[PDB]
Amino acid sequence: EDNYRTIALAFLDESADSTTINAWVNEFAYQGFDPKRIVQLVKERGTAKGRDWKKDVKMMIVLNLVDGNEPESMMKEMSEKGAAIVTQLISTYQLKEGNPGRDTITLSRVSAAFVPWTVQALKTLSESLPVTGTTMDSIAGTTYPRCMMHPSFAGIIDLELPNNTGAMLADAHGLFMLEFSKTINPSLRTKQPNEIAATFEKPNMAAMTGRFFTRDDKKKLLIAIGVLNEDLVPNPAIEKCAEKYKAK
Amino acid sequence: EDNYRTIALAFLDESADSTTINAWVNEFAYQGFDPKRIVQLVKERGTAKGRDWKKDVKMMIVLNLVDGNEPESMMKEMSEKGAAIVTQLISTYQLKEGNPGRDTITLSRVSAAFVPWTVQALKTLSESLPVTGTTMDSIAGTTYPRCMMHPSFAGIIDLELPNNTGAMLADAHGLFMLEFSKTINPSLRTKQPNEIAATFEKPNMAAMTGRFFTRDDKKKLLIAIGVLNEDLVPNPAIEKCAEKYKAKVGK
Amino acid sequence: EDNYRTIALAFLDESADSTTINAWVNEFAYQGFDPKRIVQLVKERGTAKGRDWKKDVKMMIVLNLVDGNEPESMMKEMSEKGAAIVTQLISTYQLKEGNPGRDTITLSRVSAAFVPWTVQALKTLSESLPVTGTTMDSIAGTTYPRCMMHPSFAGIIDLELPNNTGAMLADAHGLFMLEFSKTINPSLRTKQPNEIAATFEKPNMAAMTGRFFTRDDKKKLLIAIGVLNEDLVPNPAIEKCAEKYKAK
Amino acid sequence: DNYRTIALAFLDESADSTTINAWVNEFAYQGFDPKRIVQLVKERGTAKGRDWKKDVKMMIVLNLVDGNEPESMMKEMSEKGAAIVTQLISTYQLKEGNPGRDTITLSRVSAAFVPWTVQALKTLSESLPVTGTTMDSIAGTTYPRCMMHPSFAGIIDLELPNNTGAMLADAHGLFMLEFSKTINPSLRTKQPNEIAATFEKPNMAAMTGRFFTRDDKKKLLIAIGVLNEDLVPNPAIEKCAEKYKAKVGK
């Protein structure tokens, strides 16, 4: 009770159960999600409770891309019609949080799982995005593909792709990635974009190496968006990713 | 039974309807603060504390003009009595810094909502502003009207006035704005006026086009403060100021 | 009430007395301090007490230089003896960290007022500073004069000095200065060098253009500390230095 | 009186390096006391009628896994977990970063209670910021799990003969560099000798702290298999120190 040094030394003999400890780590750890699960939950929930779930997905992605990942807050800021729509989504799909536990739907999550739509929608959306294409073309030495300008793009990169092309894309995505982060957190913000990286690198690999999509799928997606050619040789704008992505 | 994956892959050719999406943006977008709402919250909150809210408004504005829009971070610098007052205002009105959501009051929003007071106050404390009356005078060929020396002035501009009097008024306001912005977002000190202008372009525009005051009200205010004559004729200085603004920004 | 637009429009006819307005302004305003005043209060207050006030001043500057400007926090972190001392100063000189009240003594104030000592003490303790000479010789090309490395320095700079050699001196001082602010605030650390810079200019000018010391006095001090030769031509280490003080 | 002259006069008031430097010392910030930390944890835990010892264990696990920023943690974990953290923060009055000495931080809990911490590392190495396997690679041999947190610096006795203490530190260094890179990424572009200097001062303080005696350190180090009953270092320690000398200055 009163000898602190000895109280502390006595901890050598305190129990340290692996099972209980890991159980704590399981509870304290950020857990990922399975994209596969998200796709299931959306559908089941939507189909259960209405409803044209395919639309909902597209709406959610838009919201997310435009407004970010906190839907409740979003409603406060917008039109009555707009807010009304959202009410339906929160109610129907139980949208919740940011990165809570597994098995729960989140707009950023939806964006990831259904990323094949997401990259399509980026085009029409470029300038209502928190970082615009236009800035990015300047920041870039060229036209920076709109399809990349969200995190979920990470979900379709194949590292295993020849010539480190997969690697390249990661770099070129990151370039966008900096800016995005100084955003979802006002700060954050320019801790030379290295600590901004460690900010995202961890769920970015996690998406990049998720096996939800096969290499064949990725290749097929990458071509369709014009990020790649049948020969699998990416465009020049990427090349400019890139070595550019280095300095920072 | 059901391939998630394939179901997801199928979204590659689910329709991506530029107009339909863009329509979606529209519903979904953030409105921007409503001056009408600010007046309401101020009155409600002040009265609920039995406070003399109108005096409070005057104080909140003076403080905004003099000290800016970040009130926690302004208290150390001032006097014991003053910091105390600021403490009350933040508490009573639930003030937030920066640019929060639309149901939130900011000192800057107070100034915009109650801009009929604000334009008046400018006259009496122009030296204590971030950019002085004298500074603006030097920049301008002539006396720059004190009433225009804050952003909130944008809220009383009728763009629709005839003879492009409205366009002209905005340009003269721009002259002050360039300085003002330089002196709140210093990142712009290194920049060129046209670059700076694009900075405040939308928010100002939002201000000029707001539905809260009517065209007739605006006329009434502009005349009252000596910007327009009863004939809608701009005070001579406005041309001078607008002209310098055109030269600096282009066109 | 009922009609918010009309209520607001009504403020056109609400009173705006300058006198009452300006009364709010001085209460709201920073309002600064007069160095002569600080000197008068240090002596007296100390002198009222048994105190050897001259000593107190150096002790206070030291404390300020390495610890910072909040005395009460300081006591918490230190030796019981050291705290005992500080305790003594605070009662006797009635020290505060804010809200300074033109007749309010703060350590930083003491440093500025008695800057002739301050510049002497800088040398002995450069490495004990929140930023170090070394940390600073790094940034700089050559040895960066320890004498400059506190804000207090600004107090002895004569802009009116020929060849803008005073202008020079203002720049070099900043170089240290930017480094200093992030520290006093960790918030700035995030910021562009400009917005930090323009977090100190307002009082740095107030110190530089202060009439406490005559131009002649400043010249005598600057020579004494080695900043100037006698022809009023400053080192090389200084042209060099602060020259770099620009890009940022 | 002329203030001004009175100042100005201060130009030649004495400025003695020794005297000044003396002052710097009584004025110096002490650095946190592990004795105090242990005291506050118990006092605060008992005060809320909690199993404080368990709490300590949780706070440590949390720290190893999630770092030193508690509130900023909570966003990314499950609600069951998030709830626990909220309670620990409330009860122990936890703060982030590197505050004043009388303040508890998760990192300080790990240091105060490092006799638990060295044990816990064995079981959760993969979940650390730098994994065991990673460490093993860099080591070329199993890098002892007990050494993979900065708190281990707390049980090093420098004075151990055959400079086994000096060795122990270098081997601890091997992990620190990697660890430092991670928690402070502004450093992974830096060379090892450069990184090492970041953690020199703090580690040193840890090693020279008076809280545990030389005898205690011996006892723990033997207990965790770093040393044998003869004060003889595990062979792996030598390899690690060597590599560390290799990466770094020497």
Short mmCIF file of N, CA, C and O in Angstrom, two decimals, chain C residues 84-165:
data_model
loop_
_atom_site.label_atom_id
_atom_site.label_comp_id
_atom_site.label_asym_id
_atom_site.label_seq_id
_atom_site.Cartn_x
_atom_site.Cartn_y
_atom_site.Cartn_z
N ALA C 84 10.94 27.30 -4.44
CA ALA C 84 10.86 28.12 -3.27
C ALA C 84 11.19 29.53 -3.66
O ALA C 84 10.61 30.48 -3.17
N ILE C 85 12.19 29.66 -4.51
CA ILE C 85 12.64 30.93 -4.97
C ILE C 85 11.57 31.62 -5.77
O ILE C 85 11.22 32.76 -5.55
N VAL C 86 11.05 30.88 -6.72
CA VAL C 86 10.11 31.41 -7.64
C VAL C 86 8.96 31.91 -6.83
O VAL C 86 8.39 32.93 -7.10
N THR C 87 8.68 31.19 -5.77
CA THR C 87 7.55 31.50 -4.96
C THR C 87 7.77 32.90 -4.51
O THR C 87 6.87 33.71 -4.50
N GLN C 88 9.00 33.17 -4.12
CA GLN C 88 9.34 34.44 -3.56
C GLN C 88 9.16 35.57 -4.55
O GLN C 88 8.69 36.62 -4.20
N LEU C 89 9.57 35.36 -5.77
CA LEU C 89 9.45 36.42 -6.72
C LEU C 89 8.02 36.76 -6.92
O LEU C 89 7.65 37.90 -6.93
N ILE C 90 7.21 35.74 -7.07
CA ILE C 90 5.86 35.96 -7.49
C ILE C 90 5.08 36.80 -6.52
O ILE C 90 4.33 37.64 -6.95
N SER C 91 5.22 36.55 -5.24
CA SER C 91 4.51 37.38 -4.30
C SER C 91 5.02 38.80 -4.36
O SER C 91 4.25 39.73 -4.39
N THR C 92 6.33 38.94 -4.32
CA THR C 92 6.95 40.24 -4.25
C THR C 92 6.71 41.10 -5.47
O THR C 92 6.40 42.26 -5.33
N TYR C 93 6.89 40.55 -6.65
CA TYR C 93 6.66 41.30 -7.87
C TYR C 93 5.31 41.07 -8.48
O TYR C 93 5.04 41.56 -9.55
N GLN C 94 4.48 40.29 -7.81
CA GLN C 94 3.12 40.13 -8.26
C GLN C 94 3.03 39.71 -9.71
O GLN C 94 2.29 40.27 -10.47
N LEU C 95 3.80 38.70 -10.07
CA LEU C 95 3.90 38.25 -11.45
C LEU C 95 2.69 37.51 -11.97
O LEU C 95 1.97 36.89 -11.22
N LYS C 96 2.48 37.59 -13.27
CA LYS C 96 1.34 37.01 -13.92
C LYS C 96 1.87 36.47 -15.21
O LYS C 96 3.00 36.74 -15.52
N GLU C 97 1.11 35.70 -15.95
CA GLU C 97 1.47 35.39 -17.33
C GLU C 97 0.49 36.02 -18.31
O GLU C 97 0.85 36.39 -19.41
N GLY C 98 -0.75 36.16 -17.86
CA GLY C 98 -1.77 36.96 -18.52
C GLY C 98 -2.74 37.22 -17.40
O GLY C 98 -2.62 36.56 -16.39
N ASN C 99 -3.69 38.13 -17.52
CA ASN C 99 -3.82 39.08 -18.59
C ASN C 99 -2.97 40.23 -18.21
O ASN C 99 -3.23 40.88 -17.23
N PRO C 100 -1.88 40.46 -19.06
CA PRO C 100 -1.07 41.60 -18.67
C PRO C 100 -1.86 42.90 -18.58
O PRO C 100 -2.64 43.17 -19.48
N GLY C 101 -1.65 43.68 -17.53
CA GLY C 101 -2.35 44.94 -17.36
C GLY C 101 -1.48 46.18 -17.29
O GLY C 101 -1.41 46.82 -16.25
N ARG C 102 -0.87 46.54 -18.41
CA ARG C 102 0.07 47.65 -18.49
C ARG C 102 0.86 47.91 -17.22
O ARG C 102 2.02 48.27 -17.27
N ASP C 103 0.24 47.69 -16.08
CA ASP C 103 1.02 47.74 -14.87
C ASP C 103 1.27 46.36 -14.31
O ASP C 103 1.49 46.17 -13.14
N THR C 104 1.26 45.38 -15.20
CA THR C 104 1.43 44.00 -14.82
C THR C 104 2.79 43.47 -15.24
O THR C 104 3.17 43.55 -16.38
N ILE C 105 3.52 42.93 -14.27
CA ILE C 105 4.85 42.41 -14.50
C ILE C 105 4.79 40.96 -14.88
O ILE C 105 4.23 40.18 -14.17
N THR C 106 5.41 40.62 -15.99
CA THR C 106 5.55 39.25 -16.44
C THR C 106 7.00 39.04 -16.80
O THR C 106 7.67 39.97 -17.18
N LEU C 107 7.47 37.81 -16.72
CA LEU C 107 8.86 37.52 -16.87
C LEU C 107 9.36 37.93 -18.21
O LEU C 107 10.47 38.34 -18.35
N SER C 108 8.56 37.72 -19.22
CA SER C 108 8.95 38.07 -20.54
C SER C 108 9.10 39.54 -20.59
O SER C 108 9.86 40.06 -21.36
N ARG C 109 8.29 40.21 -19.80
CA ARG C 109 8.34 41.64 -19.74
C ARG C 109 9.63 42.07 -19.14
O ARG C 109 10.24 42.99 -19.60
N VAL C 110 10.05 41.38 -18.10
CA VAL C 110 11.27 41.70 -17.42
C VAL C 110 12.44 41.52 -18.34
O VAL C 110 13.37 42.28 -18.30
N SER C 111 12.40 40.50 -19.14
CA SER C 111 13.45 40.26 -20.05
C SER C 111 13.59 41.35 -21.05
O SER C 111 14.67 41.66 -21.47
N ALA C 112 12.48 41.85 -21.53
CA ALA C 112 12.50 42.89 -22.50
C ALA C 112 13.01 44.19 -21.93
O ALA C 112 13.75 44.88 -22.56
N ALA C 113 12.56 44.53 -20.75
CA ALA C 113 12.89 45.76 -20.08
C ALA C 113 14.35 45.86 -19.69
O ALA C 113 14.96 46.90 -19.75
N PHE C 114 14.91 44.73 -19.30
CA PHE C 114 16.24 44.65 -18.81
C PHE C 114 17.08 43.93 -19.81
O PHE C 114 18.00 43.29 -19.47
N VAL C 115 16.78 44.13 -21.07
CA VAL C 115 17.37 43.40 -22.15
C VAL C 115 18.88 43.57 -22.17
O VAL C 115 19.56 42.73 -22.70
N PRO C 116 19.43 44.61 -21.58
CA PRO C 116 20.88 44.72 -21.56
C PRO C 116 21.54 43.60 -20.81
O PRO C 116 22.57 43.15 -21.22
N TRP C 117 20.97 43.17 -19.71
CA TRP C 117 21.41 41.95 -19.11
C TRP C 117 21.11 40.74 -19.96
O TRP C 117 21.90 39.84 -20.08
N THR C 118 19.95 40.74 -20.58
CA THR C 118 19.44 39.55 -21.17
C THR C 118 20.41 39.11 -22.19
O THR C 118 20.71 37.97 -22.28
N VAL C 119 20.91 40.05 -22.96
CA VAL C 119 21.85 39.74 -24.00
C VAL C 119 23.16 39.23 -23.50
O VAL C 119 23.86 38.58 -24.21
N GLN C 120 23.53 39.59 -22.29
CA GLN C 120 24.68 39.00 -21.64
C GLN C 120 24.48 37.56 -21.26
O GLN C 120 25.34 36.75 -21.42
N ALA C 121 23.33 37.27 -20.69
CA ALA C 121 23.03 35.95 -20.20
C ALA C 121 22.81 34.91 -21.29
O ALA C 121 22.90 33.73 -21.07
N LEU C 122 22.51 35.37 -22.48
CA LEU C 122 22.14 34.48 -23.55
C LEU C 122 23.28 33.56 -23.81
O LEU C 122 23.12 32.41 -24.09
N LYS C 123 24.47 34.11 -23.72
CA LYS C 123 25.65 33.37 -24.07
C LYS C 123 25.89 32.16 -23.19
O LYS C 123 26.20 31.09 -23.66
N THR C 124 25.77 32.34 -21.90
CA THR C 124 26.12 31.30 -20.96
C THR C 124 25.22 30.09 -21.06
O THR C 124 25.59 29.03 -20.60
N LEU C 125 24.04 30.28 -21.60
CA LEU C 125 23.01 29.26 -21.56
C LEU C 125 22.32 28.89 -22.86
O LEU C 125 21.18 28.50 -22.86
N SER C 126 23.03 28.99 -23.96
CA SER C 126 22.41 28.80 -25.25
C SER C 126 21.83 27.41 -25.42
O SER C 126 20.75 27.24 -25.94
N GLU C 127 22.57 26.41 -24.99
CA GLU C 127 22.12 25.06 -25.14
C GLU C 127 21.01 24.68 -24.17
O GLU C 127 20.38 23.66 -24.33
N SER C 128 20.77 25.50 -23.18
CA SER C 128 19.69 25.23 -22.26
C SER C 128 18.40 25.89 -22.75
O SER C 128 17.38 25.80 -22.11
N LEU C 129 18.49 26.54 -23.89
CA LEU C 129 17.35 27.21 -24.46
C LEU C 129 16.39 26.26 -25.18
O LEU C 129 16.75 25.16 -25.54
N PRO C 130 15.15 26.69 -25.36
CA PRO C 130 14.13 25.89 -25.99
C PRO C 130 14.56 25.63 -27.40
O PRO C 130 14.18 24.63 -27.98
N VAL C 131 15.40 26.50 -27.91
CA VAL C 131 16.12 26.27 -29.14
C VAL C 131 17.56 26.58 -28.81
O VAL C 131 17.81 27.45 -28.01
N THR C 132 18.50 25.88 -29.44
CA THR C 132 19.90 25.97 -29.04
C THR C 132 20.69 26.63 -30.10
O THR C 132 20.25 26.70 -31.22
N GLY C 133 21.86 27.11 -29.74
CA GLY C 133 22.70 27.80 -30.68
C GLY C 133 23.00 26.82 -31.76
O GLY C 133 22.83 27.08 -32.94
N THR C 134 23.38 25.65 -31.31
CA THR C 134 23.68 24.53 -32.16
C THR C 134 22.51 24.23 -33.08
O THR C 134 22.63 24.28 -34.29
N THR C 135 21.35 23.96 -32.50
CA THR C 135 20.13 23.86 -33.27
C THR C 135 20.03 24.98 -34.28
O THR C 135 19.38 24.86 -35.29
N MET C 136 20.72 26.08 -33.99
CA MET C 136 20.57 27.29 -34.72
C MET C 136 21.73 27.52 -35.64
O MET C 136 21.54 28.00 -36.73
N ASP C 137 22.93 27.20 -35.21
CA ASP C 137 24.07 27.24 -36.13
C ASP C 137 23.81 26.28 -37.28
O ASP C 137 24.43 26.34 -38.33
N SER C 138 22.90 25.36 -37.04
CA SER C 138 22.57 24.36 -38.02
C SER C 138 21.84 25.12 -39.07
O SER C 138 22.38 25.37 -40.13
N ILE C 139 20.62 25.49 -38.74
CA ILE C 139 19.76 26.28 -39.58
C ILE C 139 20.55 27.35 -40.30
O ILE C 139 20.41 27.53 -41.50
N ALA C 140 21.41 28.01 -39.56
CA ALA C 140 22.22 29.10 -40.07
C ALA C 140 23.47 28.58 -40.71
O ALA C 140 23.81 27.43 -40.55
N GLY C 141 24.19 29.45 -41.41
CA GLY C 141 25.39 29.03 -42.08
C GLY C 141 26.57 28.96 -41.13
O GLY C 141 27.39 28.08 -41.21
N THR C 142 26.65 29.93 -40.24
CA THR C 142 27.80 30.08 -39.35
C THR C 142 27.29 30.07 -37.95
O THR C 142 26.16 29.69 -37.72
N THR C 143 28.09 30.55 -37.03
CA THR C 143 27.65 30.70 -35.66
C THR C 143 26.64 31.84 -35.53
O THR C 143 26.89 32.96 -35.92
N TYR C 144 25.50 31.53 -34.97
CA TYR C 144 24.42 32.49 -34.87
C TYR C 144 24.45 33.14 -33.51
O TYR C 144 24.37 32.46 -32.50
N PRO C 145 24.58 34.45 -33.47
CA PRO C 145 24.97 35.08 -32.22
C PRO C 145 23.96 34.82 -31.17
O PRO C 145 22.80 35.07 -31.34
N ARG C 146 24.43 34.32 -30.05
CA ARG C 146 23.54 33.89 -29.02
C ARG C 146 22.77 35.08 -28.54
O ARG C 146 21.66 34.93 -28.09
N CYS C 147 23.38 36.24 -28.69
CA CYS C 147 22.86 37.49 -28.14
C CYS C 147 21.51 37.84 -28.73
O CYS C 147 20.66 38.36 -28.05
N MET C 148 21.32 37.51 -29.99
CA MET C 148 20.05 37.66 -30.65
C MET C 148 18.96 36.68 -30.28
O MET C 148 17.82 36.91 -30.62
N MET C 149 19.30 35.59 -29.66
CA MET C 149 18.32 34.54 -29.60
C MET C 149 17.31 34.61 -28.49
O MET C 149 17.11 33.66 -27.76
N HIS C 150 16.64 35.73 -28.41
CA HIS C 150 15.45 35.81 -27.63
C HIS C 150 14.71 36.92 -28.25
O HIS C 150 15.29 37.70 -28.99
N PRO C 151 13.41 37.00 -28.02
CA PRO C 151 12.62 38.06 -28.61
C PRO C 151 13.10 39.38 -28.06
O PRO C 151 13.15 40.37 -28.75
N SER C 152 13.59 39.32 -26.85
CA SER C 152 13.91 40.48 -26.07
C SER C 152 14.85 41.32 -26.87
O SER C 152 14.90 42.51 -26.69
N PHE C 153 15.52 40.69 -27.80
CA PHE C 153 16.53 41.32 -28.60
C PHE C 153 15.96 42.43 -29.39
O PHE C 153 16.63 43.38 -29.67
N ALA C 154 14.71 42.32 -29.75
CA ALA C 154 14.11 43.23 -30.69
C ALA C 154 14.16 44.61 -30.10
O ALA C 154 14.30 45.57 -30.78
N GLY C 155 14.16 44.65 -28.79
CA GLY C 155 14.15 45.88 -28.07
C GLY C 155 15.33 46.78 -28.32
O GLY C 155 15.23 47.95 -28.06
N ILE C 156 16.44 46.26 -28.81
CA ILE C 156 17.64 47.05 -29.01
C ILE C 156 18.04 47.29 -30.44
O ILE C 156 19.17 47.60 -30.70
N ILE C 157 17.11 47.18 -31.36
CA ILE C 157 17.44 47.26 -32.76
C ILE C 157 17.06 48.61 -33.34
O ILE C 157 15.95 49.04 -33.19
N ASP C 158 18.01 49.29 -33.98
CA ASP C 158 17.73 50.58 -34.54
C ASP C 158 17.57 50.50 -36.04
O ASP C 158 18.52 50.38 -36.77
N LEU C 159 16.34 50.61 -36.49
CA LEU C 159 16.03 50.48 -37.89
C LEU C 159 16.70 51.59 -38.65
O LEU C 159 17.12 51.41 -39.77
N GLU C 160 16.80 52.72 -37.97
CA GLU C 160 17.27 53.99 -38.50
C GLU C 160 18.75 53.94 -38.78
O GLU C 160 19.32 54.83 -39.34
N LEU C 161 19.32 52.82 -38.42
CA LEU C 161 20.70 52.55 -38.60
C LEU C 161 20.92 52.58 -40.08
O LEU C 161 20.06 52.19 -40.86
N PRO C 162 22.05 53.12 -40.48
CA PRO C 162 22.33 53.32 -41.88
C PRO C 162 22.46 52.01 -42.60
O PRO C 162 22.83 51.01 -42.01
N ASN C 163 22.15 52.01 -43.89
CA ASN C 163 22.27 50.84 -44.74
C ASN C 163 21.35 49.76 -44.29
O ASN C 163 21.60 48.60 -44.49
N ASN C 164 20.26 50.17 -43.67
CA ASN C 164 19.26 49.24 -43.24
C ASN C 164 19.87 48.09 -42.46
O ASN C 164 19.28 47.01 -42.30
N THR C 165 21.06 48.34 -41.95
CA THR C 165 21.72 47.38 -41.11
C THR C 165 20.84 47.04 -39.94
O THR C 165 21.04 46.06 -39.26
#
